[PDB]
Design an enzyme around this catalytic site. Structure first.
Site, mmCIF file in Angstrom:
data_model
loop_
_atom_site.group_PDB
_atom_site.id
_atom_site.type_symbol
_atom_site.label_atom_id
_atom_site.label_comp_id
_atom_site.label_asym_id
_atom_site.label_seq_id
_atom_site.Cartn_x
_atom_site.Cartn_y
_atom_site.Cartn_z
ATOM 1 N N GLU A 52 0.734 -1.154 0.084
ATOM 2 C CA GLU A 52 0.010 0.090 0.033
ATOM 3 C C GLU A 52 0.885 1.412 0.158
ATOM 4 O OE1 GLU A 52 -3.328 -0.437 2.778
ATOM 5 O OE2 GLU A 52 -3.788 -2.139 1.644
ATOM 6 N N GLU B 144 -4.609 -8.617 -1.295
ATOM 7 C CA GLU B 144 -4.739 -8.471 0.258
ATOM 8 C C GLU B 144 -6.234 -8.295 0.272
ATOM 9 O OE1 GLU B 144 -2.501 -5.820 2.727
ATOM 10 O OE2 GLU B 144 -4.118 -5.656 4.614
HETATM 11 C C1 LIG Z 1 -3.701 -4.478 4.751
HETATM 12 C C2 LIG Z 1 -2.412 -4.441 5.628
HETATM 13 O O1 LIG Z 1 -1.294 -4.718 4.674
HETATM 14 C C3 LIG Z 1 -2.398 -5.310 6.802
HETATM 15 O O2 LIG Z 1 -1.073 -5.148 7.325
HETATM 16 C C4 LIG Z 1 -3.514 -4.820 7.839
HETATM 17 O O3 LIG Z 1 -3.591 -5.950 8.846
HETATM 18 C C5 LIG Z 1 -4.953 -4.729 6.984
HETATM 19 C C6 LIG Z 1 -6.168 -4.424 8.001
HETATM 20 O O4 LIG Z 1 -6.308 -3.146 8.144
HETATM 21 O O5 LIG Z 1 -6.683 -5.326 8.539
HETATM 22 C C7 LIG Z 1 -4.810 -4.266 5.759
HETATM 23 N N1 LIG Z 1 -4.746 -2.471 6.095
HETATM 24 C C8 LIG Z 1 -5.678 -1.599 5.087
HETATM 25 C C9 LIG Z 1 -6.026 -0.393 5.436
HETATM 26 C C10 LIG Z 1 -7.214 0.252 4.982
HETATM 27 C C11 LIG Z 1 -7.188 1.890 4.529
HETATM 28 C C12 LIG Z 1 -8.486 2.259 4.263
HETATM 29 C C13 LIG Z 1 -8.877 3.695 5.100
HETATM 30 C C14 LIG Z 1 -9.840 4.433 4.561
HETATM 31 C C15 LIG Z 1 -9.886 5.873 5.102
HETATM 32 N N2 LIG Z 1 -10.302 6.959 4.184
HETATM 33 N N3 LIG Z 1 -9.863 8.206 3.894
HETATM 34 N N4 LIG Z 1 -9.524 9.389 4.520
#
Ligand SMILES: *[C@@H]1[C@H](O)[C@@H](O)[C@H](O)[C@@H](C(=O)O)[C@H]1NCCCCCCCCN=[N+]=[N-]
Ligand SMILES: *[C@@H]1O[C@H](CO[C@@H]2O[C@@H](C)[C@@H](O)[C@@H](O)[C@@H]2O)[C@@H](O[C@@H]2O[C@H](CO)[C@@H](O)[C@H](O)[C@H]2NC(C)=O)[C@H](O)[C@H]1NC(C)=O
Ligand SMILES: *[C@@H]1O[C@H](CO)[C@@H](O)[C@H](O)[C@H]1NC(C)=O
Ligand SMILES: *[C@@H]1O[C@H](CO)[C@@H](O)[C@H](O)[C@H]1NC(C)=O
Ligand SMILES: *[C@@H]1O[C@H](CO)[C@@H](O)[C@H](O)[C@H]1NC(C)=O
Length: 508
Positions: A190, A308
């Protein structure tokens, strides 16, 4: 009238998914304290992982970009003890964790889990090192379980002028070469949120060059055809979509597939009603179309992979993501992903922190595990199409593939239908001619016991699904239907149905 007519489109596959279509992740944060990687030495865990072969296992997560390979790193009591007990023995057949070490790590894990989960909503983010031993644990778990390891490399190691500094990755690739490891790679997790996470903005054009750079190192290595995937961008919001676009323009030539991530909900705000809402199911489609527009504009025909994905970000929705109710989202994701052209779907997570795990802290399978296992045994790689006659196709959701021909009960030509009923009443499906007078095997999943949809146990055709023991999955017992019967789907349930002797030409 609760009787719905199906149409089937069986003349040719819409898409061919990978045999590894249903794949899994282990979050990179399991290495933050690498002692906990020793948990992957469990035979119970292996038994479960093996049930999902073939599959990719992606080691990756937020921590991907805060992990540093250190060959000199010092080992803990737990690691030395684990490895000392594996000597002179076939690790894949007979490997286990010393009981003292297993008990110690099971006692510490709930604390560790809380810590890992809070690092999400923490503003600060620290570096950690990992040893050769850590890499070895991961490789051996994947190899022994019949899984293909994908290892995410740290993209926040930077030169003065913000190029990727590849010296750490080079130490690792050298080490993996010297061991004969068959591993595939990623770089970064990400990158769209690197500003937020690390005060460093890398644009997509720059990230493309970092990939080309990594590509050159993989061409030099002893594994010249190691696969390379990226960029593992988050949810394709506008800004992320632009980063993806510029990434694919710059470095899209050297990736074997495009990886992106999807979550339906925020784990902190998700409700039971969100898990059952077809509008929530439907929004996934919007994401998929935006990704394919970006890819088609820049690298048309390039494979697209969900790198993911889960029900909810933040580690999952408490009391929801580990239940039978989590299945609607999981099965629909697989259904839609297959039908819309995604070749691989990597479930966050197989095991680890959070409650969107397929397997819990005791290595016990949750309902999504059994759902996954059934999918894997029944659903083939060739994707066909089904539809419901009517405009209430939102709540009765149907998917159709060729039957998995690795399954010894079935044969070429056979069809596997799967369906989701989100109505609060039973619905009955009528199969179309020429499938209207066939033997059909029903595989209906339902929650066990008083919690209903929020239960963590599940039954297959009335029989509780449970490991037989640590070494042994149960049989998954079909319920043969009367030829020509309608296919009954109770309220808020999901099922597979294998249409035997369907003799579909496309499935041969
Ligand atoms: C993917 C990440 O690689 C993992 O390490 C995490 O455990 C996983 C998770 O959150 O469970 C995941 N992370 C994604 C994060 C989501 C981002 C969206 C936020 C939206 C906010 N918007 N605005 N402004
Ligand atoms: C059960 O769901 C209905 C809506 O689904 C329809 O009715 C079912 C009984 C079944 O026949 C399905 O196949 C149908 O698709 C709920 O009623 C709706 O509730 C919403 C939101 O509260 C409301 O705005 C709508 O007007 C209602 N629509 C209709 C057609 O009645 C019903 O309340 C649900 N029952 C529960 C939660 O117990
Ligand atoms: C992590 O380590 C790298 C390389 O030593 C360094 O450049 C980076 O700034 C560090 N980040 C943090 C948050 O410690
Ligand atoms: C890259 O990182 C290595 C290892 O930390 C460091 O010694 C080297 O000077 C760095 N190179 C550049 C170009 O920054
Ligand atoms: C991307 O980053 C580079 C430096 O890393 C910069 O010079 C370039 O202008 C940037 N391009 C865009 C389109 O932002």
């Amino acid at each position: 009238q609760d009787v719905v007519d199906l149409d089937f489109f069986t003349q040719e596959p819409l898409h061919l998914v990978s045999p590894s279509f249903l794949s899994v992740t282990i979050d990179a944060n399991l290495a933050t304290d690498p002692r906990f990687l020793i948990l992957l030495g469990s035979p119970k865990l292996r038994t479960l992982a093996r049930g999902l072969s073939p599959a990719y296992l992606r080691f990756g997560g937020t921590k991907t970009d805060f992990l540093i390979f250190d060959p000199k790193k010092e080992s803990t009591f737990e690691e030395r003890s684990y490895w000392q007990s594996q000597v002179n023995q076939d690790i894949c057949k007979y490997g286990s964790i010393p009981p003292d070490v297993e008990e110690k790590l099971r006692l510490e894990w709930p604390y560790q889990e809380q810590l890992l989960l809070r690092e999400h909503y923490q503003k600060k983010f620290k570096n950690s090192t990992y040893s050769r031993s850590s890499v070895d644990v991961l490789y051996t778990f994947a190899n022994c379980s019949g899984l293909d390891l994908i290892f995410g490399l740290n993209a926040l190691l930077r030169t003065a002028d913000l190029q990727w500094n590849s010296s750490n990755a080079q130490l690792l690739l050298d080490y993996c070469s010297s061991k004969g490891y068959n591993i595939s790679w990623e770089l970064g997790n990400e990158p769209n949120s690197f500003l937020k996470k690390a005060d460093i903005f890398i644009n997509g054009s720059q990230l493309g060059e970092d990939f080309i750079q990594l590509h050159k190192l993989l061409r030099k290595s002893t594994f010249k055809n190691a696969k390379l995937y990226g960029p593992d961008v988050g949810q394709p919001r506008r800004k992320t979509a632009k980063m993806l676009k510029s990434f694919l323009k710059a470095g899209g030539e050297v990736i074997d597939s495009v990886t992106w991530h999807h979550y339906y909900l925020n784990g902190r705000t998700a409700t039971r009603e969100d898990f059952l809402n077809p509008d929530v199911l439907d929004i996934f489609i919007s994401s998929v179309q935006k990704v394919f527009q970006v890819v088609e504009s820049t690298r048309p025909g390039k494979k697209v992979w969900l790198g993911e994905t889960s029900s909810a970000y933040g580690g999952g929705a408490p009391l929801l993501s580990d239940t039978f109710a989590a299945g609607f989202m999981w099965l629909d994701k697989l259904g839609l992903s297959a039908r819309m052209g995604i070749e691989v779907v990597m479930r966050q997570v197989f095991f680890g922190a959070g409650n969107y795990h397929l397997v819990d802290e005791n290595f016990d399978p949750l309902p999504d595990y059994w759902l996954s296992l059934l999918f894997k045994k029944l659903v083939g790689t060739k994707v066909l199409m089904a539809s419901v006659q009517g405009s209430k196709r939102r709540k009765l959701r149907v998917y159709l593939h060729c039957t998995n021909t690795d399954n010894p009960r079935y044969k070429e030509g056979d069809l596997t239908l799967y369906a989701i009923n989100l109505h609060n009443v039973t619905k009955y499906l009528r199969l179309p001619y020429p499938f209207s007078n066939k033997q059909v095997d029903k595989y209906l999943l339902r929650p066990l016991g008083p919690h209903g949809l929020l239960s963590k146990s599940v039954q297959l055709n009335g029989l509780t699904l449970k490991m037989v023991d640590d070494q042994t999955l149960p049989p998954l017992m079909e319920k043969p239907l009367r030829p020509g019967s309608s296919l009954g789907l109770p309220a808020f349930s999901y099922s597979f149905f294998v249409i035997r002797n369907a003799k579909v030409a496309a499935c041969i």
